[PDB]
Antibody
């Protein structure tokens, strides 16, 4: 139904832009199409929407910096938030709804910072009846980063922890538990992706 | 500038137990919507017009209220109902949201599985040395990790992180990472990760020897 897209890192004082490509319904037929964001801390804020007709409605406190427009032909609408500040760092979601029904996108994170993109360094964590394996992803910026095990075949038994900020760099860790008789017999590898720097690393966990 | 106060911020409920969450408005509001958001996904409207249900929302859920007091009730909870619930109003501009109420699911106490990991080769080859410790699948969430190098609590310089309540077994997991410099690391020998939870009188210890 709805997918959000746009650059991840945007400098303070500049403008933030996002695209929502809708599929399975004409955004000119019906529904109200909104832009809603969630700040780190989970606080939510409705930003605005545009009717089936280019008529718009914005959150008063954003009225001077926001603009919502669309391109019928491509079945997508956009969001521009001018003069961003770090306070605009958030997960942006696009959505639609009528009195009875709503649809949302997966949401896309945008970081407003003067800091510069830094790839992460992936380190393996092997043991000092199941065995617990790890993977340390540290020194990167901005968020997000994705971590999978064996390309996803090892999804269950995985605990990927929230990243923690420190010295203007995020650090994260991930764990996976498997039967003692599976590792190191069968290869266990953590896959890490960091789109902001187009990084894709693979670290085999060696005993 | 219409403040929505939700209470409590966090609350736990056993399966089958009735559950009620409150939303207090700073000024009267005519309507109120509720949204549900589970870990890793996006909000989803749960209730509109203060009391109506959108297709897909279990009948066990119901909303009610008026003026400055609204509430979301779960007649009987199921573990699938664990999430954060936000109330919102469209009466004034802008359409404010409450800070949300996190509904935890209660369950028997479960001891944490502890695992400790020495710095890797790749890392030690960059002068770095991060010691990591995992405390997986425990309950209650409140727990405390303690680092010790050569028998002395290496207190500061530790980064901890918690996962949300597991959707499968309803437990919690946490990670503790003490970062040192390659040189300070090779200057000590005993590295212990000590965890004190509700599941044991004595702390659960785990520790390697740098050799």
């Amino acid at each position: 139904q709805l997918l959000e897209s746009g650059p991840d890192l945007v400098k303070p004082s500049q403008s933030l832009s996002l695209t929502c490509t809708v599929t399975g319904y004409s955004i000119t037929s019906g529904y109200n199409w909104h832009w809603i964001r969630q700040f780190p801390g989970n606080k939510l804020e409705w930003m605005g929407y545009i009717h089936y007709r280019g008529t718009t409605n914005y959150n008063t406190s954003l009225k001077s910096r926001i603009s919502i427009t669309r391109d019928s032909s491509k079945n997508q609408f956009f969001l521009q938030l001018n003069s961003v500040t770090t306070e605009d760092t958030a997960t942006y979601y696009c959505a639609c709804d009528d009195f009875y029904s709503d649809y949302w996108g997966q949401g896309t994170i945008v970081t407003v910072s003067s800091a510069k993109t830094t790839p992460p360094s992936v380190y393996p964590l092997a043991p000092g009846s199941m065995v617990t394996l790890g993977c340390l992803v540290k020194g990167y910026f901005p968020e997000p980063v994705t971590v999978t095990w064996n390309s996803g075949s090892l999804s269950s038994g995985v605990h990927t922890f929230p990243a923690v900020l420190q010295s203007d760099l995020y650090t994260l860790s991930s764990s996976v538990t498997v039967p003692s008789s599976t590792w190191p017999s069968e290869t266990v590898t953590c896959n890490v992706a960091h789109p902001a720097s187009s990084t894709k690393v693979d670290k085999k966990i060696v005993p | 500038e219409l403040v929505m106060t939700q209470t409590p911020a966090i609350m736990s409920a056993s399966p089958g137990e009735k559950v009620t969450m409150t939303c207090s408005a700073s000024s009267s509001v005519s309507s109120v919507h509720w949204y549900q958001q589970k870990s890793g996904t996006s909000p989803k409207r749960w209730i509109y017009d203060t009391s109506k249900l959108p297709s897909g929302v279990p009948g066990r859920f119901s909303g009610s209220g008026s003026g400055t007091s609204y509430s979301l009730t779960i007649s009987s909870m199921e573990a699938e109902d664990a999430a954060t619930y936000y109330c919102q109003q469209w009466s004034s501009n802008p359409p404010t949201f409450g800070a949300g109420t996190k509904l935890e699911v209660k369950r028997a106490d479960a001891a944490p599985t502890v695992s400790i990991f020495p710095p890797s080769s790749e890392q030690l080859t960059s002068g770095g040395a991060s010691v990591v410790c995992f405390l997986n699948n425990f309950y209650p969430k409140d727990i405390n990790v303690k680092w010790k190098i050569d028998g002395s609590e290496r207190q500061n310089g530790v980064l901890n992180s918690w996962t949300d309540q597991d959707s499968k077994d309803s437990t919690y997991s946490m990670s503790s990472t003490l970062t040192l410099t390659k040189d300070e690391y090779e200057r000590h020998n005993s590295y212990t990760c000590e965890a004190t939870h509700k599941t044991s009188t004595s702390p659960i210890v785990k520790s390697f020897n740098r050799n």
